[PDB]
Amino acid sequence: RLEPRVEERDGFWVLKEEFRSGINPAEKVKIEKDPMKLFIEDGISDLATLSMEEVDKSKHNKDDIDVRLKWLGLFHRRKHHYGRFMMRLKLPNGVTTSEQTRYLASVIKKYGKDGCADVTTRQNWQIRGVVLPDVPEIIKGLESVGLTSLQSGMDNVRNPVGNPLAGIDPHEIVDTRPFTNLISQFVTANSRGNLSITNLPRKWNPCVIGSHDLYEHPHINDLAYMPATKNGKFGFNLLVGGFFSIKRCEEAIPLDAWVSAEDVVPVCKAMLEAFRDLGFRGNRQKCRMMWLIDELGMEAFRGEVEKRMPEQVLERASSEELVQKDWERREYLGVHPQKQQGLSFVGLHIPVGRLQADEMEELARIADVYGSGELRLTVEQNIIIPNVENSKIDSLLNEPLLKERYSPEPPILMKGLVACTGSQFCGQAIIETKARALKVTEEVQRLVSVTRPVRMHWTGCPNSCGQVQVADIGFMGCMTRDENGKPCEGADVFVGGRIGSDSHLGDIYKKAVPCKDLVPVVAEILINQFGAVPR
């Protein structure tokens, strides 16, 4: 045991025969045909042929559409958008150009009532509505503007998140951009696909911290790079194993490793390989990297990463940390000064992250006209317009879709509002979230007033995409039954989760609250635990 269970064969990575025992349905799909063959052997061109009738006629085509295709970031919404797809990108740091968002808006347009977009909770774009016939043209389209959507989906490395203010931030510990990009470019082998790394046992979330506020939520990632100097030289201490699941939630923990700026990619490479090689591949809810870790114990696991890297030395964690523990999270919504003299950024609302095609164009145009032609997406499903001259602020704050839809200064509960895709499009969802979230917040601001910023997170199912455990107040979809037995959408309410340097995970606080009784419960928590007032 601790002998690598996957080897290279004819260019692709595959689980050896003798380690094939308990393996789950996803592991059987991967074996039957490496999903990357859809992109590498252009299997994708043949997929754009099939009508949906033909696809569902055979078990192999139905795996491709529903599973394999996730490696090309294409997610079939079988239950809710049959024959249409949600497409997930690769966007290190949340940085997107106005050409990108424009190009995205144009792909969206083509579906009218059936296209929209979303900022995800890893500051990523999701596009909605696509159909197979369009994919080959959309991949060319995304490549021609900087994006790839490669490996965004199953057992790959997910969007590397960084500080949303990377490179414009007045109090910035390290510009995070190079590192998230370095990682993104590494994993994706420059949009060409890194096969050594697409046969993991499970998803894997990386992040890189550059802000004292810890906007990058290091505690919630499989690998979290934490700024600390070692010998004059700058670098990161490694936090490891953080994750949410149906069955388990674990906060990331020190690996006790320091790594220099140059060694960032190397460790990530080494650690992905340790995972790929050694991770469990049976029951799927025991497959995220943390399980491997407690199975071997920390040291033995460090040993495993250590021995996997260039010189086979992994330096120990340094005591010289750069993030300042006693620190209060800055608001980013609104007008804020940059570190560049005479420039400000403007954080914009984005109700629940949802955007339409017409509105995406306007942001893009506003970025061009006021800023540097770019935008910063953020983990609270909002976007910041960076680099505007202070002269232009006034006019900018006077623009139609800033007054109307995407406010720089929304009401206070909206400011920290986050919600997952929900049952509007997501096959997995127990409740509808995005609309329900705006309705419940609405009625809550009506009934109480709060001064403290408060973070509410809706998630539609225990997968916790919406990160209920990090929220002040959280909402996990469940179904409930009336005293008459009538099925009503409802949510578990989580209280007490904490963000930043003194992070904590929230606890179920009242179980199975039905959707009609939801507002009272929230109000009563607001007044009792967040100094809110009636009226």
Ligand code: SRM
């Ligand atoms: C878009 C997003 C929700 C959102 O509205 O923002 C998302 C979308 C999906 N998540 Fe997620 N997850 C999203 C953040 C998360 C997070 C938060 C994070 O990464 O910081 C987590 C927890 C972190 C973690 O992994 O521990 C998360 C943990 C999951 C899991 C649980 C993994 C597990 O071991 O149980 C699933 C189900 C799975 O993978 O087995 C899941 C499954 C899904 C699927 C693919 C479900 C499905 O089959 O369709 C959702 C796609 C729904 C759709 O059509 O939009 N999603 N999901 C967020 C992803 C943005 C991105 O670029 O990746």
Ligand code: SF4
């Ligand atoms: S939390 Fe559940 S309902 Fe929401 S996007 Fe994730 S899997 Fe879907």
